[PDB]
């Protein structure tokens, strides 16, 4: 159910080499909160990869601590997938967390590295969140 304490979800960004603005994935519910993958180019240069939580809510009383593994899937060999871990207390003023320079843009778009295919790159997040506060009273 949506109350699950953890989950793994993916989002495939199409026309990746042409990405010019931030893109958001549909939500994956964990602890009954919407979590989304946010990807954005940073300075071509680097791939920005962030995990967002409950950004749509107008509430300013919620908080949720979570740990996650952000990974860019290598379609040729999963062992070559690149990942970084995060731990963060999400709340209205800090509702997303990740890396502005997760990977070099040149590396992810290199047709010989195995991260891109048909100009598509897949991002994956494994999130483990604690019970949130200020949500379900």
């Amino acid at each position: 159910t949506s109350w699950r304490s953890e989950a793994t979800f993916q989002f495939t960004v199409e026309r990746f080499s042409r990405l010019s603005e931030s893109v958001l994935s549909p939500p994956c519910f964990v602890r009954n909160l919407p979590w989304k993958i946010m990807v954005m180019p940073r300075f071509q240069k680097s791939v920005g990869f962030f995990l967002q939580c409950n950004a749509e809510s107008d509430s300013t009383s919620w908080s949720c601590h979570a740990q996650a593994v952000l990974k860019i899937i290598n379609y040729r060999d999963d062992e070559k997938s690149f990942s970084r871990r995060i731990s963060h207390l999400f709340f209205h003023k800090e509702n997303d967390w990740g890396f502005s320079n997760f990977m070099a843009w040149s590396e992810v778009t290199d047709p010989e590295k195995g991260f891109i295919d048909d100009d598509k790159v897949t991002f994956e997040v494994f999130v483990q969140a604690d019970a949130p506060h200020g949500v379900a009273w």
Binding site: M40, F50, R84, W97, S100
Partner: peptide, 4 residues
């Protein structure tokens, strides 16, 4: 790590 940081916010976007």
């Amino acid at each position: 790590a940081s916010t976007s």
